[model samples]
Target chain A: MYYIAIDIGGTQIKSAVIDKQLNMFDYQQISTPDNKSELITDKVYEIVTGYMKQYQLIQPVIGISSAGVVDEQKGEIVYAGPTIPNYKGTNFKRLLKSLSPYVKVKNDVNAALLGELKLHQYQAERIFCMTLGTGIGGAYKNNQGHIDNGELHKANEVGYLLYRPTENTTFEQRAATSALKKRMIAGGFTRSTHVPVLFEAAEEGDDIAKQILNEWAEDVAEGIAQIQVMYDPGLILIGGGISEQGDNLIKYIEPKVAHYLPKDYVYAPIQTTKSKNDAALYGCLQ
Target chain B: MYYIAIDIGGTQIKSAVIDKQLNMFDYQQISTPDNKSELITDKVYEIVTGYMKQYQLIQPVIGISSAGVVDEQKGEIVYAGPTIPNYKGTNFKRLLKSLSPYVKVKNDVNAALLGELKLHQYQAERIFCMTLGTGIGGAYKNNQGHIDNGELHKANEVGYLLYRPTENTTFEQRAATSALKKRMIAGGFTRSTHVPVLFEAAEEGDDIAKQILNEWAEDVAEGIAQIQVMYDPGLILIGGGISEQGDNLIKYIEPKVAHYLPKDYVYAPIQTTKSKNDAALYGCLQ
Candidate 1:
């Protein structure tokens, strides 16, 4: 028996085939489907069909995780969100089911979380995992490590409100590779090591670098703090390329979360997710 | 088999014995342990033991939902937030177990969410409940309705951040009843219901009252809009005395959330919780 998991992100669509043991035997990615919902579904179907044919797998339980307000029970994309246009009211499960019978769909963020929850089997009755990147994504885990469609608040875009006060608010506008790339491009630097060089400059004596990293940490903290007052989870797993920034990010956050949190909630203990970027990839298998 | 649920707050302790069917058979409220964390644990022990005697129930499982950072894996309170004094570093499950072998402890917000999750099974997969009062409290429920610890972010305090140029930058400071009470005291309104009645007067066209409500709504909206961005739950459940204001409150919110949320997620549907005061009382049962 096999379960197939698909991760539909803002920029890419990735799929994988995993068995009961959660070992992803095969995987592939494509540019994200153009904003049209039907076209996106078609693209998904075509990719799945191709993967199935190449891997000789049939009727796998297919799960899809996408960006939007997900009607998990209905297995539909209730709202398309800005990135995935023409998906305002599409039944992803229905669409996928029409594509094939053994289809299951979860929102992309939920799927990312499912990947980890199924893997860790943390004894905690509750757990929350966040993917921190150009934006933030959230998923919660039950005692059994199953992915539950939690209250779908606007988490991914929280980085907007969080980082707005500092500088750039748009995903491609700030902190993200795009934000960094734009500055590099404008600064007349076409070198390959610009990112590392910029980071090193910040580490040494660059006010601009320090400011951007500080702003990023504050943004992440404010967003997490928003989640904190709401869920107050036992554990929060932080994933995404930005999370790779590690302690530099954590140091800026700890105090802000503590300071702004209700005075009663000071000293709240939060742990960055121990899981790596492969969380969703693992979910495809799990 | 029966389960005992308890909600311990700084001022009061409420508990209920619930059967497997989710029917709360017995409920009681009493003054909570005063001052220190050690005594808080002692009081919890006393209440569980005392309550057990009243029910004449033999060996029922006990679950305690409370405040601050809880290490559910260890069944301990990692740190005591300000709600109660000296609350950190407490081994609640272990201590409660010493009183009765079958006691499990959780954060209060998580318990309320677990209760609400069971109460509203349709939206059970992911449940977000915000309790508004002196400060905001929140909890999330996974599909299983098992609320251990999650997201560790403080809920409802989103009021602390200033989005619309309020006198107070913090939403909690501006919107919570605690803030209202402080305002009333400062304004020299001694009689009970003076503030709410004034707010009602404002609703009825009083200029001062209208100003206060507008400020209140903006602050509340700041927190709520941020939450709208952060959680993106299938449902947004708001519970608290302030929620009693109903559409007077609702109408003020939709526009503000719309303004702050991204264009893609501008109109995400949100439901002000109908559960009201019964949340914690009922949470004890869940």
Candidate 2:
């Protein structure tokens, strides 16, 4: 069986065709259409048509990993942030019904975690995954081997976890990679939004860069400590674009997470995402 | 059949005899012995023996609601704070085996939530409960109608939710009723480690008193907002000694919670625990 996997992110849309054994083909990426929801649907339809024609495939299944509060049962985006306009009511299953009958949709973070679980064959009773990018996203797999969305489908919204009234900021506003970029710009260290420059400067023994990175890591550690206390999942996986930094990111955050947690509290082990950026696309296999 | 219910707290130990219909009799209280874990076990044994003799009971099942990280399956206190000296490793089921073989144990906050659910007959699929006193504690009933203790029996540890680096404090240090008392003393409003005086002064329009309460409410609201986003439980119940203030506590917290949450987030309704201080004792009925 062939699967057409689509990952709809705030800044980009990634699509690919995969076989039953998870072999990828025709991988492509494009800037996400933010002006209107219909444009997104049109783009997805085009991608599907192109894949069918290029591969000459018959009746392939479609899986969507979306960046919003998704209702998996209905295959619709029930709620979304300002990142995408008119995205709240995008019903993918119905919109793409004529193209394919087998359609599955999941929250992007949930899908990414699922993909990691499938790739690694982890059997932990409970596992948590957090993504630190333009914003922070979180999801967890329960002992029942299912993603827990809570009563209102808002569980694991870690970005909103810590709110500092004095600063009027949340965990995401303080610790997200975008926040790091903003700090870098404020410090007159960089003109670009990308964070590789900051990492490079910090590694070169730049005092100011080190201080800024440490401050951001403190915020990240605070959130991770909270996750440790609140869920105490068997393991935690950190993902998103910054996760590509690998050991550099984990090294700064791990020790500080220990400092923030209570003495003697057993915390979950933290690691980087195994599937990296393609996690959501691979998760469609589930 | 009658049940022997014991509620062990930091400041006090409350015990009572309750019948199958939930009617209470011969209720009593005593200071919780903190010098040693064996003292607590001895005290519980003494209470059970006295009750058995007074009521002429034969092998009444025992239920213990305790202040600590309780391993319910083993009826043991796996972890506790400095507030209770030598509290960890107190095995109630094994220690009380001579008095009753059917001994059951649970964390105080979990027991309190269970008590509220039973007394009010709440049928919500999920409900979160937080207790604000000398320290803040939290618990939740999941969709399966069981208190979720997480993988390490540490879930819903909301007191550790928010951490501030500059002041080096946690949600409990900032929002617990103990914090309120400290603020009251610092403001020269009251020297006693009690908060009812602060409430009275605030009701009389005392500026300092009102400001203190508002600041404390902001902290409380921040934590509640985090809970709403993290769990989105169908209902949230606030308990502990301070919760006895009823509407006074709810009024100060509800509006601030709305202010802290994302613009359109649907938060759970907050209410005071119906069972009040006896929640733990009643939760033993579970």
Candidate 3:
């Protein structure tokens, strides 16, 4: 038997094929169907069809990790932001009706959490996984190493959490990679300066880059500290684009996180996700 | 059969005898045992014995709701703050020995949540119960109308969450009743100007009282908005002494919460807890 995995994001649709042995193949990424709901399904059908021809397996399991409020049991997008046009109420049962009789759907953050849990062998009873990318996403892992979506499928929408309550600022607006990059560019850095380049510039003793990265790390740490106090998860995992930076990331965050937590409280150790970029795909396999 | 329900707080210990029919009797309140761990247990034992004589019943069921981090399975306090000196590590099973073979223990915040869930007939699958007293306490209720203690019984310590991360200010430090009263006193109010008196003054067009309340509500609303974004509970319940103001509490908070939430996000309704002052005791009946 083979499995089909798809990760639906606002910017791109990433897909892969996995065999019974868990070996993934035929991985590909393409631009998302221009924010149109129908085009999304059509693009999905087109991708799955290409893989189906090569695999030729009967009733292969299909899994989707989506970027909106998902009703996993119903495999529908309950709600969506403006980034994904008409993305809500997408019934996968109908969207992928021609593809597979067996399909599973989950919120992307949840899928990433599952992947991290799998990668870490479920060492911690409680885990907080955060992805800092175009926006900040969060997922909570329980003792059973599963995502517990509290009634509304909105258990860990950390991006919207307040960073500066009086100013009405959110975590995403301050700590996301996109925000960081934007701020760096606005501060006279090259328009094309990516997060890594800024970090490299900081490492090479660029005073401006060092200051911006420090502020960014502090902002990120504040959000993590709030999670620690509220959830007290045993482990905190940072994922998404900058996660591959590993110790380079935690070094900047750990000290700031300490300042936010009370000296008496036991703070969870922060680490980078082992699954990194392909976390959602791996969770789809699960 | 009857159950003995006890709610242990920083200032007082309240207990009651509840029948299986949910009728409560022999309800009594007394000052806490002067911050001594052993004295606390002795006081509890004395209270239960007095109730025992009144009921004249053998093998009465016992339940305790205490103000600290509780390990219910071990029936022990896992952690405590200065408010309840040396409360952590006190074993309830040992403390209540010889009185009842069966006893249950839980954190007071979690107990209040259970009581509120019972009062509402568990209408909202996801519920956030907050208690604002000398300090604020938070509890998260899941779809099953149960507190999903993430790990180590620290799932919803929202009071400890950061309202001003840069300044390292916590929600409770700025929004608790104690903080409000202290501010009122510092602003030329009498030493004993209670919350009700302040509300009355506001009703009579006292600008000082109104300003304090508006600022307090904004602080509280900021915390609630953070909870709204992080957990996205279906319902948010405000408990503790001040919640009795019901409509007054909601009116001050509702609009500020709306301001914090994104236009695309659906905000949860904030309301007063149905259990009121007896919430923790009622939960002990469980």
Q: Pick the candidate with the highest lDDT.
A: 2
What are the TM values for chain B, all candidates?
A: 0.79, 0.95, 0.94
lDDT of each: 0.60, 0.82, 0.78
**With candidate 1 superimposed using the best TM-score fit, by how many Å does residue A15's alpha carbon deviate from the native?**
62
**TM-score on B-chain, cand. 3:** 0.94
lDDT of each residue in A65-130, candidate 2, tens digit only: 988888888899988866678889999999888878888998889888988887786656889999
* Candidate 3 runs further than 4 Å off: A1-286, B163-168
Tens digits of per-residue lDDT for model 2, B181-241: 7888777775233476577778988898888889889999999999888888998899998
Determine which window of 10 residues in candidate 2 chain A has minimal summed lDDT.
A29-38
Tens-digit lDDT track for model 1 on A131-203?
A: 6543456776655645555466334433343445465464324545555556556554443223444555666
Better of 1 and 3 by TM-score: 3
| Tens-digit per-residue lDDT, A84-185, candidate 3 | 788888888677776677889988888888866665675678988988876688889777756778788877888887657786778888777657877897
TM-score of every model versus the real structure: 0.44, 0.49, 0.49
Q: What is the overall TM-score of model 2 with all chains considered together?
A: 0.49
Position B153, candidate 1: lDDT: 36
